Amino acid sequence: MKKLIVDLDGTLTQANTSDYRNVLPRLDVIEQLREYHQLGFEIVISTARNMRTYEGNVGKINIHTLPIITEWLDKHQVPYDEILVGKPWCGHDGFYIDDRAVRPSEFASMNLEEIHQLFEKEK
């Protein structure tokens, strides 16, 4: 069992507009997801989207946010096995620290061998 846990905004999107319905896709990143799906990886979209607007209220995110996510994922033929909302929002200046984390430009640029290598170096 192997999953990719994939952020939505800025990772699968170009984050060019506040209108989530019409945000531009990052095509190279999405195409890489497809190749990983072919390799047996499950794809989990995990996102903090609208955690700021609703002050962490998942009950509201489930109503106003989820529909537009799925609609957008479908329109751009992004493969996904799961969607998860309510991810902790780091804030404007915040960020995530993780030994198994890659940035979307590294994911698009590297094969599995050399992603494995990035991680082994940490260990």
According to CB under 8 A, which one of 15, 20, 25, 76 is a site residue for a copy of itself?
A: 15
Question: Using the rule CB under 8 A, is 23 a contact of a copy of itself?
Answer: no
**Which helix or strand (DSSP H or E) is residue 5 part of?**
strand 3-6
Number of residues in the chain: 123
Question: Using the rule CB under 5 A, is 94 a contact of Hg ion?
Answer: yes
Name the 3-class secondary structure at 104.
Answer: helix
Query: Contacts with a copy of itself: how many residues (CB under 8 A)?
Result: 58
Question: Using the rule CB under 8 A, is 56 a contact of a copy of itself?
Answer: yes
Question: Using the rule CB under 8 A, is 102 a contact of a copy of itself?
Answer: yes
According to CB under 8 A, which one of 28, 31, 82, 114 is a site residue for a copy of itself?
A: 82
Residues 53, 17: contact at Cβ < 8 Å? no
According to CB under 8 A, which one of 19, 98, 113, 120 is a site residue for a copy of itself?
A: 98
